[PDB]
């Protein structure tokens, strides 16, 4: 039960599902690692305001609507990942940049 979604954009933001792996990550967007009863909101350092606001909405949906409330949403920042994220993805590499939005 693992999914990853990329949250990329500006004023129109898209949440697209992606491989569960560090390779999918970049330092400029937000990602949502669905871990069942725990949901990880991870935003790159160079994330924009919009992505982080939509990222929060995407998280809400999984908990409220796919996990019927039974889920905690943990917000973290590039370089300060929860031990549980590193357990799943292995140790984080120097992440590549994000593209234009």
């Amino acid at each position, epitope marked *: 039960v693992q999914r990853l979604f990329q949250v990329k954009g500006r004023r129109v933001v898209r949440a697209t599902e992606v491989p569960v792996s560090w390779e999918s990550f970049n330092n400029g967007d937000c990602f949502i690692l669905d*871990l069942g009863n*725990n949901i*990880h909101q991870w935003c790159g350092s160079n994330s924009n305001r919009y992505e982080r606001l939509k990222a929060t909405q995407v998280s809400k949906g999984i908990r409220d609507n796919e996990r019927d409330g039974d889920a*905690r949403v*943990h*917000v*973290s*920042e590039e370089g*300060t*990942e*929860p*031990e*549980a994220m*590193l*357990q799943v993805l*292995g*140790p984080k590499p120097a992440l590549p940049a994000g593209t234009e939005d």
Partner: nanobody, 127 residues
């Protein structure tokens, strides 16, 4: 598979002290929130103290403020609980716990926020 193991419980007299420790084993990549719970005979599982990933912000149950001091050692990957001025209402099995999902702040007072636990240690304060 991070594991937890408690040590250092034992017997103590009403007024005495005791120090509990929890060693985290298995592969880890970073620091994490840890906490102490206890369970008395009859009674159910209750919070005692929890600490943030860095050891910087702590929280204490009502029974616990003043007498207990929680600290963390991140290279050792342990957690400690110093228990001063013990009375027999403190007699219980004391459990180590970890919240690997929390990225900042101490742990909460609920057990369901803790995902990793040890098998406990016995603490007996007799009057």
């Amino acid at each position: 598979q991070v594991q937890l193991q408690e040590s250092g419980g034992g017997l103590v007299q009403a007024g005495g002290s005791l120090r509990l420790s929890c060693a985290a084993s298995g592969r880890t990549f970073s620091s994490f929130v840890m906490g102490w719970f206890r369970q008395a005979p009859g009674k159910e599982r209750e919070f005692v103290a929890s600490i943030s990933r860095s050891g910087s912000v702590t929280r204490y149950a009502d029974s616990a403020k003043g007498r207990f001091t929680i600290s963390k050692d991140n290279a050792k990957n342990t957690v400690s609980l110093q228990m001063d001025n013990l009375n027999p209402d403190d007699t219980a099995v004391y459990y180590c716990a970890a919240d690997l999902h929390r990225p900042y702040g101490p742990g909460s007072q609920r057990t369901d926020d803790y995902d990793t636990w040890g098998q406990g240690t016995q603490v007996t304060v007799s009057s």
